[PDB]
mmCIF file with all atom_site columns, N, CA and C and ligand atoms in Angstrom:
data_model
loop_
_atom_site.group_PDB
_atom_site.id
_atom_site.type_symbol
_atom_site.label_atom_id
_atom_site.label_alt_id
_atom_site.label_comp_id
_atom_site.label_asym_id
_atom_site.label_entity_id
_atom_site.label_seq_id
_atom_site.pdbx_PDB_ins_code
_atom_site.Cartn_x
_atom_site.Cartn_y
_atom_site.Cartn_z
_atom_site.occupancy
_atom_site.B_iso_or_equiv
_atom_site.pdbx_formal_charge
_atom_site.auth_seq_id
_atom_site.auth_comp_id
_atom_site.auth_asym_id
_atom_site.auth_atom_id
_atom_site.pdbx_PDB_model_num
ATOM   1   N  N   . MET N 1 1  ? 35.347 80.223  -49.519 1.00 36.76 ? 1  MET N N   1
ATOM   2   C  CA  . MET N 1 1  ? 35.609 80.933  -50.801 1.00 36.76 ? 1  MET N CA  1
ATOM   3   C  C   . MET N 1 1  ? 34.613 82.098  -50.982 1.00 36.76 ? 1  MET N C   1
ATOM   4   N  N   . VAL N 1 2  ? 35.121 83.292  -51.326 1.00 37.00 ? 2  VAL N N   1
ATOM   5   C  CA  . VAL N 1 2  ? 34.291 84.515  -51.554 1.00 37.00 ? 2  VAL N CA  1
ATOM   6   C  C   . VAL N 1 2  ? 34.487 84.911  -53.005 1.00 37.00 ? 2  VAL N C   1
ATOM   7   N  N   . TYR N 1 3  ? 33.361 85.123  -53.703 1.00 36.42 ? 3  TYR N N   1
ATOM   8   C  CA  . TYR N 1 3  ? 33.401 85.553  -55.101 1.00 36.42 ? 3  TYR N CA  1
ATOM   9   C  C   . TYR N 1 3  ? 32.590 86.817  -55.257 1.00 36.42 ? 3  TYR N C   1
ATOM   10  N  N   . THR N 1 4  ? 32.693 87.385  -56.447 1.00 39.20 ? 4  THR N N   1
ATOM   11  C  CA  . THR N 1 4  ? 32.055 88.670  -56.723 1.00 39.20 ? 4  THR N CA  1
ATOM   12  C  C   . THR N 1 4  ? 30.837 88.396  -57.600 1.00 39.20 ? 4  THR N C   1
ATOM   13  N  N   . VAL N 1 5  ? 29.730 88.914  -57.126 1.00 39.86 ? 5  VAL N N   1
ATOM   14  C  CA  . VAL N 1 5  ? 28.496 89.024  -57.924 1.00 39.86 ? 5  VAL N CA  1
ATOM   15  C  C   . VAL N 1 5  ? 28.474 90.467  -58.441 1.00 39.86 ? 5  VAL N C   1
ATOM   16  N  N   . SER N 1 6  ? 28.439 90.619  -59.743 1.00 38.84 ? 6  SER N N   1
ATOM   17  C  CA  . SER N 1 6  ? 28.332 91.919  -60.408 1.00 38.84 ? 6  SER N CA  1
ATOM   18  C  C   . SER N 1 6  ? 26.884 92.104  -60.729 1.00 38.84 ? 6  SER N C   1
ATOM   19  N  N   . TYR N 1 7  ? 26.345 93.222  -60.372 1.00 40.87 ? 7  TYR N N   1
ATOM   20  C  CA  . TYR N 1 7  ? 24.964 93.566  -60.717 1.00 40.87 ? 7  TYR N CA  1
ATOM   21  C  C   . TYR N 1 7  ? 25.033 94.599  -61.841 1.00 40.87 ? 7  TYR N C   1
ATOM   22  N  N   . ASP N 1 8  ? 24.465 94.274  -62.998 1.00 42.68 ? 8  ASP N N   1
ATOM   23  C  CA  . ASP N 1 8  ? 24.505 95.133  -64.153 1.00 42.68 ? 8  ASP N CA  1
ATOM   24  C  C   . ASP N 1 8  ? 23.133 95.638  -64.455 1.00 42.68 ? 8  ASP N C   1
ATOM   25  N  N   . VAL N 1 9  ? 22.982 96.943  -64.336 1.00 44.24 ? 9  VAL N N   1
ATOM   26  C  CA  . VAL N 1 9  ? 21.732 97.648  -64.620 1.00 44.24 ? 9  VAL N CA  1
ATOM   27  C  C   . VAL N 1 9  ? 22.046 98.520  -65.851 1.00 44.24 ? 9  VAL N C   1
ATOM   28  N  N   . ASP N 1 10 ? 21.640 97.998  -66.982 1.00 41.85 ? 10 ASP N N   1
ATOM   29  C  CA  . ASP N 1 10 ? 21.895 98.651  -68.248 1.00 41.85 ? 10 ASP N CA  1
ATOM   30  C  C   . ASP N 1 10 ? 23.336 99.165  -68.425 1.00 41.85 ? 10 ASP N C   1
ATOM   31  N  N   . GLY N 1 11 ? 24.282 98.301  -68.063 1.00 42.49 ? 11 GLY N N   1
ATOM   32  C  CA  . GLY N 1 11 ? 25.641 98.575  -68.142 1.00 42.49 ? 11 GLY N CA  1
ATOM   33  C  C   . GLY N 1 11 ? 26.338 99.219  -67.020 1.00 42.49 ? 11 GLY N C   1
ATOM   34  N  N   . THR N 1 12 ? 25.584 99.757  -66.059 1.00 45.90 ? 12 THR N N   1
ATOM   35  C  CA  . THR N 1 12 ? 26.154 100.241 -64.839 1.00 45.90 ? 12 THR N CA  1
ATOM   36  C  C   . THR N 1 12 ? 26.326 99.071  -63.935 1.00 45.90 ? 12 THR N C   1
ATOM   37  N  N   . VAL N 1 13 ? 27.544 98.840  -63.451 1.00 47.08 ? 13 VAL N N   1
ATOM   38  C  CA  . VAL N 1 13 ? 27.791 97.580  -62.689 1.00 47.08 ? 13 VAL N CA  1
ATOM   39  C  C   . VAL N 1 13 ? 28.334 97.948  -61.354 1.00 47.08 ? 13 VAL N C   1
ATOM   40  N  N   . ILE N 1 14 ? 27.705 97.292  -60.408 1.00 42.69 ? 14 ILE N N   1
ATOM   41  C  CA  . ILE N 1 14 ? 28.099 97.332  -58.984 1.00 42.69 ? 14 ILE N CA  1
ATOM   42  C  C   . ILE N 1 14 ? 28.518 95.927  -58.579 1.00 42.69 ? 14 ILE N C   1
ATOM   43  N  N   . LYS N 1 15 ? 29.650 95.831  -57.895 1.00 42.03 ? 15 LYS N N   1
ATOM   44  C  CA  . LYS N 1 15 ? 30.243 94.525  -57.514 1.00 42.03 ? 15 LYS N CA  1
ATOM   45  C  C   . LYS N 1 15 ? 30.007 94.320  -56.007 1.00 42.03 ? 15 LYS N C   1
ATOM   46  N  N   . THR N 1 16 ? 29.619 93.110  -55.614 1.00 42.32 ? 16 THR N N   1
ATOM   47  C  CA  . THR N 1 16 ? 29.457 92.789  -54.213 1.00 42.32 ? 16 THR N CA  1
ATOM   48  C  C   . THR N 1 16 ? 30.106 91.428  -53.964 1.00 42.32 ? 16 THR N C   1
ATOM   49  N  N   . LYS N 1 17 ? 30.761 91.241  -52.818 1.00 42.91 ? 17 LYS N N   1
ATOM   50  C  CA  . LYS N 1 17 ? 31.480 89.970  -52.621 1.00 42.91 ? 17 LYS N CA  1
ATOM   51  C  C   . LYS N 1 17 ? 30.539 89.046  -51.865 1.00 42.91 ? 17 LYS N C   1
ATOM   52  N  N   . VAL N 1 18 ? 30.511 87.779  -52.270 1.00 43.45 ? 18 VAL N N   1
ATOM   53  C  CA  . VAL N 1 18 ? 29.562 86.839  -51.610 1.00 43.45 ? 18 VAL N CA  1
ATOM   54  C  C   . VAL N 1 18 ? 30.267 85.522  -51.386 1.00 43.45 ? 18 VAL N C   1
ATOM   55  N  N   . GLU N 1 19 ? 30.054 84.958  -50.205 1.00 41.95 ? 19 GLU N N   1
ATOM   56  C  CA  . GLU N 1 19 ? 30.593 83.666  -49.842 1.00 41.95 ? 19 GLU N CA  1
ATOM   57  C  C   . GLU N 1 19 ? 29.930 82.564  -50.661 1.00 41.95 ? 19 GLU N C   1
ATOM   58  N  N   . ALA N 1 20 ? 30.746 81.741  -51.327 1.00 44.14 ? 20 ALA N N   1
ATOM   59  C  CA  . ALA N 1 20 ? 30.212 80.603  -52.057 1.00 44.14 ? 20 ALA N CA  1
ATOM   60  C  C   . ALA N 1 20 ? 29.359 79.710  -51.116 1.00 44.14 ? 20 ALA N C   1
ATOM   61  N  N   . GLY N 1 21 ? 28.268 79.204  -51.671 1.00 42.13 ? 21 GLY N N   1
ATOM   62  C  CA  . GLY N 1 21 ? 27.338 78.322  -50.965 1.00 42.13 ? 21 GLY N CA  1
ATOM   63  C  C   . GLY N 1 21 ? 26.394 79.007  -50.001 1.00 42.13 ? 21 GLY N C   1
ATOM   64  N  N   . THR N 1 22 ? 26.389 80.341  -49.955 1.00 44.97 ? 22 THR N N   1
ATOM   65  C  CA  . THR N 1 22 ? 25.414 81.029  -49.151 1.00 44.97 ? 22 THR N CA  1
ATOM   66  C  C   . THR N 1 22 ? 24.334 81.580  -50.088 1.00 44.97 ? 22 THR N C   1
ATOM   67  N  N   . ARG N 1 23 ? 23.195 81.949  -49.523 1.00 47.22 ? 23 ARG N N   1
ATOM   68  C  CA  . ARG N 1 23 ? 22.216 82.667  -50.290 1.00 47.22 ? 23 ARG N CA  1
ATOM   69  C  C   . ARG N 1 23 ? 22.723 84.099  -50.460 1.00 47.22 ? 23 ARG N C   1
ATOM   70  N  N   . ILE N 1 24 ? 22.473 84.666  -51.623 1.00 43.08 ? 24 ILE N N   1
ATOM   71  C  CA  . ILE N 1 24 ? 22.843 86.040  -51.931 1.00 43.08 ? 24 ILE N CA  1
ATOM   72  C  C   . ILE N 1 24 ? 21.700 86.909  -51.418 1.00 43.08 ? 24 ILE N C   1
ATOM   73  N  N   . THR N 1 25 ? 22.026 88.036  -50.799 1.00 42.46 ? 25 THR N N   1
ATOM   74  C  CA  . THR N 1 25 ? 20.988 88.991  -50.405 1.00 42.46 ? 25 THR N CA  1
ATOM   75  C  C   . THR N 1 25 ? 20.687 89.913  -51.589 1.00 42.46 ? 25 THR N C   1
ATOM   76  N  N   . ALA N 1 26 ? 19.487 89.958  -52.180 1.00 43.00 ? 26 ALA N N   1
ATOM   77  C  CA  . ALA N 1 26 ? 19.225 90.843  -53.287 1.00 43.00 ? 26 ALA N CA  1
ATOM   78  C  C   . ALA N 1 26 ? 19.417 92.290  -52.949 1.00 43.00 ? 26 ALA N C   1
ATOM   79  N  N   . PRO N 1 27 ? 19.943 93.069  -53.890 1.00 44.45 ? 27 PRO N N   1
ATOM   80  C  CA  . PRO N 1 27 ? 19.907 94.492  -53.791 1.00 44.45 ? 27 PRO N CA  1
ATOM   81  C  C   . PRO N 1 27 ? 18.509 94.991  -53.720 1.00 44.45 ? 27 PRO N C   1
ATOM   82  N  N   . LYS N 1 28 ? 18.323 96.235  -53.328 1.00 44.87 ? 28 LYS N N   1
ATOM   83  C  CA  . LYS N 1 28 ? 17.043 96.848  -53.473 1.00 44.87 ? 28 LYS N CA  1
ATOM   84  C  C   . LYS N 1 28 ? 16.829 96.913  -54.993 1.00 44.87 ? 28 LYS N C   1
ATOM   85  N  N   . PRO N 1 29 ? 15.591 96.726  -55.428 1.00 46.85 ? 29 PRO N N   1
ATOM   86  C  CA  . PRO N 1 29 ? 15.362 96.607  -56.822 1.00 46.85 ? 29 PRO N CA  1
ATOM   87  C  C   . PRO N 1 29 ? 15.582 97.912  -57.552 1.00 46.85 ? 29 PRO N C   1
ATOM   88  N  N   . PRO N 1 30 ? 16.157 97.846  -58.722 1.00 49.36 ? 30 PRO N N   1
ATOM   89  C  CA  . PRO N 1 30 ? 16.356 98.978  -59.561 1.00 49.36 ? 30 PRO N CA  1
ATOM   90  C  C   . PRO N 1 30 ? 15.066 99.406  -60.143 1.00 49.36 ? 30 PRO N C   1
ATOM   91  N  N   . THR N 1 31 ? 15.062 100.664 -60.544 1.00 49.34 ? 31 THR N N   1
ATOM   92  C  CA  . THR N 1 31 ? 13.884 101.263 -61.144 1.00 49.34 ? 31 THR N CA  1
ATOM   93  C  C   . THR N 1 31 ? 14.319 101.926 -62.443 1.00 49.34 ? 31 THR N C   1
ATOM   94  N  N   . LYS N 1 32 ? 13.376 102.036 -63.343 1.00 47.63 ? 32 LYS N N   1
ATOM   95  C  CA  . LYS N 1 32 ? 13.612 102.622 -64.659 1.00 47.63 ? 32 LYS N CA  1
ATOM   96  C  C   . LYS N 1 32 ? 12.341 103.332 -65.101 1.00 47.63 ? 32 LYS N C   1
ATOM   97  N  N   . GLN N 1 33 ? 12.392 104.643 -65.248 1.00 46.82 ? 33 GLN N N   1
ATOM   98  C  CA  . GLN N 1 33 ? 11.213 105.373 -65.646 1.00 46.82 ? 33 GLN N CA  1
ATOM   99  C  C   . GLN N 1 33 ? 10.617 104.835 -66.922 1.00 46.82 ? 33 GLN N C   1
ATOM   100 N  N   . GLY N 1 34 ? 9.302  104.611 -66.897 1.00 44.98 ? 34 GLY N N   1
ATOM   101 C  CA  . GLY N 1 34 ? 8.533  104.079 -67.966 1.00 44.98 ? 34 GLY N CA  1
ATOM   102 C  C   . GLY N 1 34 ? 8.599  102.583 -68.139 1.00 44.98 ? 34 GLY N C   1
ATOM   103 N  N   . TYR N 1 35 ? 9.306  101.899 -67.231 1.00 45.37 ? 35 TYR N N   1
ATOM   104 C  CA  . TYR N 1 35 ? 9.577  100.508 -67.366 1.00 45.37 ? 35 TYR N CA  1
ATOM   105 C  C   . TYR N 1 35 ? 9.307  99.839  -65.989 1.00 45.37 ? 35 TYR N C   1
ATOM   106 N  N   . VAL N 1 36 ? 9.253  98.524  -66.040 1.00 44.21 ? 36 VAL N N   1
ATOM   107 C  CA  . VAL N 1 36 ? 9.052  97.682  -64.912 1.00 44.21 ? 36 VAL N CA  1
ATOM   108 C  C   . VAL N 1 36 ? 10.196 96.719  -64.721 1.00 44.21 ? 36 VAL N C   1
ATOM   109 N  N   . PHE N 1 37 ? 10.746 96.668  -63.512 1.00 44.52 ? 37 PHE N N   1
ATOM   110 C  CA  . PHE N 1 37 ? 11.803 95.713  -63.209 1.00 44.52 ? 37 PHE N CA  1
ATOM   111 C  C   . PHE N 1 37 ? 11.257 94.302  -63.181 1.00 44.52 ? 37 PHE N C   1
ATOM   112 N  N   . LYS N 1 38 ? 11.848 93.407  -63.942 1.00 41.95 ? 38 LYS N N   1
ATOM   113 C  CA  . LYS N 1 38 ? 11.406 92.029  -64.048 1.00 41.95 ? 38 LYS N CA  1
ATOM   114 C  C   . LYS N 1 38 ? 12.252 91.045  -63.325 1.00 41.95 ? 38 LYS N C   1
ATOM   115 N  N   . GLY N 1 39 ? 13.364 91.497  -62.840 1.00 43.02 ? 39 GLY N N   1
ATOM   116 C  CA  . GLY N 1 39 ? 14.192 90.670  -62.017 1.00 43.02 ? 39 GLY N CA  1
ATOM   117 C  C   . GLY N 1 39 ? 15.644 90.662  -62.490 1.00 43.02 ? 39 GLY N C   1
ATOM   118 N  N   . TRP N 1 40 ? 16.442 89.890  -61.800 1.00 42.92 ? 40 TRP N N   1
ATOM   119 C  CA  . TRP N 1 40 ? 17.861 89.705  -62.073 1.00 42.92 ? 40 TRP N CA  1
ATOM   120 C  C   . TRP N 1 40 ? 18.054 88.408  -62.805 1.00 42.92 ? 40 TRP N C   1
ATOM   121 N  N   . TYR N 1 41 ? 18.658 88.474  -63.979 1.00 42.61 ? 41 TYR N N   1
ATOM   122 C  CA  . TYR N 1 41 ? 18.773 87.314  -64.822 1.00 42.61 ? 41 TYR N CA  1
ATOM   123 C  C   . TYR N 1 41 ? 20.235 86.948  -65.038 1.00 42.61 ? 41 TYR N C   1
ATOM   124 N  N   . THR N 1 42 ? 20.456 85.675  -65.345 1.00 47.44 ? 42 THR N N   1
ATOM   125 C  CA  . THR N 1 42 ? 21.840 85.204  -65.521 1.00 47.44 ? 42 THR N CA  1
ATOM   126 C  C   . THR N 1 42 ? 22.457 85.651  -66.820 1.00 47.44 ? 42 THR N C   1
ATOM   127 N  N   . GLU N 1 43 ? 21.610 86.177  -67.694 1.00 50.59 ? 43 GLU N N   1
ATOM   128 C  CA  . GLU N 1 43 ? 22.083 86.740  -68.897 1.00 50.59 ? 43 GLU N CA  1
ATOM   129 C  C   . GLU N 1 43 ? 21.186 87.907  -69.212 1.00 50.59 ? 43 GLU N C   1
ATOM   130 N  N   . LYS N 1 44 ? 21.715 88.840  -69.973 1.00 49.77 ? 44 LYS N N   1
ATOM   131 C  CA  . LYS N 1 44 ? 20.875 89.985  -70.361 1.00 49.77 ? 44 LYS N CA  1
ATOM   132 C  C   . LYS N 1 44 ? 19.699 89.542  -71.256 1.00 49.77 ? 44 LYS N C   1
ATOM   133 N  N   . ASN N 1 45 ? 20.030 88.638  -72.187 1.00 50.89 ? 45 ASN N N   1
ATOM   134 C  CA  . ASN N 1 45 ? 19.043 87.909  -73.015 1.00 50.89 ? 45 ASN N CA  1
ATOM   135 C  C   . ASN N 1 45 ? 19.286 86.385  -72.919 1.00 50.89 ? 45 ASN N C   1
ATOM   136 N  N   . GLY N 1 46 ? 18.216 85.627  -72.767 1.00 50.07 ? 46 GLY N N   1
ATOM   137 C  CA  . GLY N 1 46 ? 18.246 84.182  -72.869 1.00 50.07 ? 46 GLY N CA  1
ATOM   138 C  C   . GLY N 1 46 ? 18.709 83.426  -71.657 1.00 50.07 ? 46 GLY N C   1
ATOM   139 N  N   . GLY N 1 47 ? 18.853 84.116  -70.540 1.00 50.56 ? 47 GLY N N   1
ATOM   140 C  CA  . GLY N 1 47 ? 19.108 83.415  -69.294 1.00 50.56 ? 47 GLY N CA  1
ATOM   141 C  C   . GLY N 1 47 ? 17.832 83.175  -68.482 1.00 50.56 ? 47 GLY N C   1
ATOM   142 N  N   . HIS N 1 48 ? 18.032 82.980  -67.183 1.00 51.43 ? 48 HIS N N   1
ATOM   143 C  CA  . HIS N 1 48 ? 16.929 82.700  -66.237 1.00 51.43 ? 48 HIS N CA  1
ATOM   144 C  C   . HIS N 1 48 ? 16.999 83.645  -65.082 1.00 51.43 ? 48 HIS N C   1
ATOM   145 N  N   . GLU N 1 49 ? 15.878 83.769  -64.401 1.00 50.94 ? 49 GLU N N   1
ATOM   146 C  CA  . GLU N 1 49 ? 15.791 84.683  -63.303 1.00 50.94 ? 49 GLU N CA  1
ATOM   147 C  C   . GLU N 1 49 ? 16.436 84.053  -62.085 1.00 50.94 ? 49 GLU N C   1
ATOM   148 N  N   . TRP N 1 50 ? 17.327 84.776  -61.460 1.00 52.33 ? 50 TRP N N   1
ATOM   149 C  CA  . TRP N 1 50 ? 17.832 84.376  -60.143 1.00 52.33 ? 50 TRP N CA  1
ATOM   150 C  C   . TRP N 1 50 ? 16.782 84.577  -59.127 1.00 52.33 ? 50 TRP N C   1
ATOM   151 N  N   . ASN N 1 51 ? 16.630 83.588  -58.298 1.00 52.53 ? 51 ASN N N   1
ATOM   152 C  CA  . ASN N 1 51 ? 15.705 83.627  -57.177 1.00 52.53 ? 51 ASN N CA  1
ATOM   153 C  C   . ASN N 1 51 ? 16.517 83.638  -55.892 1.00 52.53 ? 51 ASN N C   1
ATOM   154 N  N   . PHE N 1 52 ? 16.527 84.776  -55.225 1.00 53.26 ? 52 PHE N N   1
ATOM   155 C  CA  . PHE N 1 52 ? 17.436 84.936  -54.155 1.00 53.26 ? 52 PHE N CA  1
ATOM   156 C  C   . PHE N 1 52 ? 17.071 84.108  -52.930 1.00 53.26 ? 52 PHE N C   1
ATOM   157 N  N   . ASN N 1 53 ? 15.850 83.602  -52.912 1.00 51.31 ? 53 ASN N N   1
ATOM   158 C  CA  . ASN N 1 53 ? 15.440 82.717  -51.884 1.00 51.31 ? 53 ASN N CA  1
ATOM   159 C  C   . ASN N 1 53 ? 15.828 81.283  -52.063 1.00 51.31 ? 53 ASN N C   1
ATOM   160 N  N   . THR N 1 54 ? 15.883 80.831  -53.311 1.00 51.49 ? 54 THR N N   1
ATOM   161 C  CA  . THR N 1 54 ? 16.140 79.446  -53.551 1.00 51.49 ? 54 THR N CA  1
ATOM   162 C  C   . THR N 1 54 ? 17.563 79.148  -53.986 1.00 51.49 ? 54 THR N C   1
ATOM   163 N  N   . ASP N 1 55 ? 18.262 80.196  -54.453 1.00 51.31 ? 55 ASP N N   1
ATOM   164 C  CA  . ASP N 1 55 ? 19.516 79.995  -55.185 1.00 51.31 ? 55 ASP N CA  1
ATOM   165 C  C   . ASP N 1 55 ? 20.698 80.218  -54.290 1.00 51.31 ? 55 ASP N C   1
ATOM   166 N  N   . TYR N 1 56 ? 21.799 79.555  -54.623 1.00 48.26 ? 56 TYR N N   1
ATOM   167 C  CA  . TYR N 1 56 ? 22.961 79.562  -53.789 1.00 48.26 ? 56 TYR N CA  1
ATOM   168 C  C   . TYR N 1 56 ? 24.101 80.067  -54.579 1.00 48.26 ? 56 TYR N C   1
ATOM   169 N  N   . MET N 1 57 ? 24.896 80.890  -53.898 1.00 50.30 ? 57 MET N N   1
ATOM   170 C  CA  . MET N 1 57 ? 26.033 81.491  -54.578 1.00 50.30 ? 57 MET N CA  1
ATOM   171 C  C   . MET N 1 57 ? 26.958 80.409  -55.142 1.00 50.30 ? 57 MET N C   1
ATOM   172 N  N   . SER N 1 58 ? 27.301 80.501  -56.431 1.00 50.75 ? 58 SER N N   1
ATOM   173 C  CA  . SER N 1 58 ? 28.256 79.635  -57.139 1.00 50.75 ? 58 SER N CA  1
ATOM   174 C  C   . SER N 1 58 ? 29.709 79.847  -56.686 1.00 50.75 ? 58 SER N C   1
ATOM   175 N  N   . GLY N 1 59 ? 30.575 78.856  -56.913 1.00 52.40 ? 59 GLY N N   1
ATOM   176 C  CA  . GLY N 1 59 ? 32.022 79.004  -56.625 1.00 52.40 ? 59 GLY N CA  1
ATOM   177 C  C   . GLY N 1 59 ? 32.814 79.748  -57.703 1.00 52.40 ? 59 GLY N C   1
ATOM   178 N  N   . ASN N 1 60 ? 32.256 80.870  -58.207 1.00 51.28 ? 60 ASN N N   1
ATOM   179 C  CA  . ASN N 1 60 ? 32.881 81.678  -59.208 1.00 51.28 ? 60 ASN N CA  1
ATOM   180 C  C   . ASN N 1 60 ? 32.168 83.006  -59.193 1.00 51.28 ? 60 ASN N C   1
ATOM   181 N  N   . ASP N 1 61 ? 32.907 84.022  -59.606 1.00 49.10 ? 61 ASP N N   1
ATOM   182 C  CA  . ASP N 1 61 ? 32.337 85.312  -59.949 1.00 49.10 ? 61 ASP N CA  1
ATOM   183 C  C   . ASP N 1 61 ? 31.260 85.143  -61.049 1.00 49.10 ? 61 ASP N C   1
ATOM   184 N  N   . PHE N 1 62 ? 30.211 85.948  -61.003 1.00 48.02 ? 62 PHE N N   1
ATOM   185 C  CA  . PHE N 1 62 ? 29.264 85.986  -62.098 1.00 48.02 ? 62 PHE N CA  1
ATOM   186 C  C   . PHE N 1 62 ? 28.488 87.304  -62.022 1.00 48.02 ? 62 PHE N C   1
ATOM   187 N  N   . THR N 1 63 ? 27.788 87.552  -63.103 1.00 46.14 ? 63 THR N N   1
ATOM   188 C  CA  . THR N 1 63 ? 27.028 88.779  -63.286 1.00 46.14 ? 63 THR N CA  1
ATOM   189 C  C   . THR N 1 63 ? 25.554 88.439  -63.318 1.00 46.14 ? 63 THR N C   1
ATOM   190 N  N   . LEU N 1 64 ? 24.769 89.297  -62.646 1.00 45.00 ? 64 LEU N N   1
ATOM   191 C  CA  . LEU N 1 64 ? 23.333 89.273  -62.752 1.00 45.00 ? 64 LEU N CA  1
ATOM   192 C  C   . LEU N 1 64 ? 22.886 90.560  -63.420 1.00 45.00 ? 64 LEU N C   1
ATOM   193 N  N   . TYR N 1 65 ? 21.958 90.364  -64.334 1.00 41.36 ? 65 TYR N N   1
ATOM   194 C  CA  . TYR N 1 65 ? 21.582 91.450  -65.233 1.00 41.36 ? 65 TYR N CA  1
ATOM   195 C  C   . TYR N 1 65 ? 20.139 91.875  -64.924 1.00 41.36 ? 65 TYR N C   1
ATOM   196 N  N   . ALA N 1 66 ? 19.919 93.157  -64.635 1.00 41.41 ? 66 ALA N N   1
ATOM   197 C  CA  . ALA N 1 66 ? 18.608 93.637  -64.502 1.00 41.41 ? 66 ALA N CA  1
ATOM   198 C  C   . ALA N 1 66 ? 17.853 93.634  -65.800 1.00 41.41 ? 66 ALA N C   1
ATOM   199 N  N   . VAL N 1 67 ? 16.636 93.094  -65.817 1.00 41.42 ? 67 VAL N N   1
ATOM   200 C  CA  . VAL N 1 67 ? 15.809 93.104  -66.996 1.00 41.42 ? 67 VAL N CA  1
ATOM   201 C  C   . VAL N 1 67 ? 14.619 93.966  -66.750 1.00 41.42 ? 67 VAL N C   1
ATOM   202 N  N   . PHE N 1 68 ? 14.321 94.858  -67.709 1.00 40.40 ? 68 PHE N N   1
ATOM   203 C  CA  . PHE N 1 68 ? 13.206 95.692  -67.607 1.00 40.40 ? 68 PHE N CA  1
ATOM   204 C  C   . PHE N 1 68 ? 12.213 95.491  -68.774 1.00 40.40 ? 68 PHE N C   1
ATOM   205 N  N   . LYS N 1 69 ? 10.938 95.748  -68.498 1.00 42.42 ? 69 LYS N N   1
ATOM   206 C  CA  . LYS N 1 69 ? 9.885  95.686  -69.474 1.00 42.42 ? 69 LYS N CA  1
ATOM   207 C  C   . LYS N 1 69 ? 9.233  97.051  -69.556 1.00 42.42 ? 69 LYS N C   1
ATOM   208 N  N   . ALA N 1 70 ? 8.978  97.553  -70.762 1.00 42.58 ? 70 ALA N N   1
ATOM   209 C  CA  . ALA N 1 70 ? 8.290  98.813  -70.914 1.00 42.58 ? 70 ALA N CA  1
ATOM   210 C  C   . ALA N 1 70 ? 6.913  98.697  -70.382 1.00 42.58 ? 70 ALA N C   1
ATOM   211 N  N   . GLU N 1 71 ? 6.493  99.769  -69.764 1.00 43.80 ? 71 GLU N N   1
ATOM   212 C  CA  . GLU N 1 71 ? 5.123  99.846  -69.235 1.00 43.80 ? 71 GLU N CA  1
ATOM   213 C  C   . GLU N 1 71 ? 4.217  99.801  -70.473 1.00 43.80 ? 71 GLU N C   1
ATOM   214 N  N   . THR N 1 72 ? 3.087  99.100  -70.384 1.00 42.52 ? 72 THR N N   1
ATOM   215 C  CA  . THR N 1 72 ? 2.139  98.987  -71.549 1.00 42.52 ? 72 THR N CA  1
ATOM   216 C  C   . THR N 1 72 ? 0.762  99.339  -71.114 1.00 42.52 ? 72 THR N C   1
HETATM 217 CA CA1 . CA  R 2 .  ? 21.561 98.070  -71.700 1.00 41.47 ? 3  CA  R CA1 1
HETATM 218 CA CA1 . CA  R 2 .  ? 22.411 85.612  -74.035 1.00 37.40 ? 4  CA  R CA1 1
#
């Protein structure tokens, strides 16, 4: 089974197809001027960080959301 992982970077979404039960290969990390990339999360707010080393592709399409933190 192959599903789509959508990568959403502040609403810009890129779709990649991934075989269920395999590890997902992370994209090159996004960048945002004045901000720091904090990782890919299962929700834009209130989810958890996907760990591409430990995590396995689900048997469904899903979206990973880039989270950024302002530089301080
Ligand atoms: Ca946004
Ligand atoms: Ca949420």
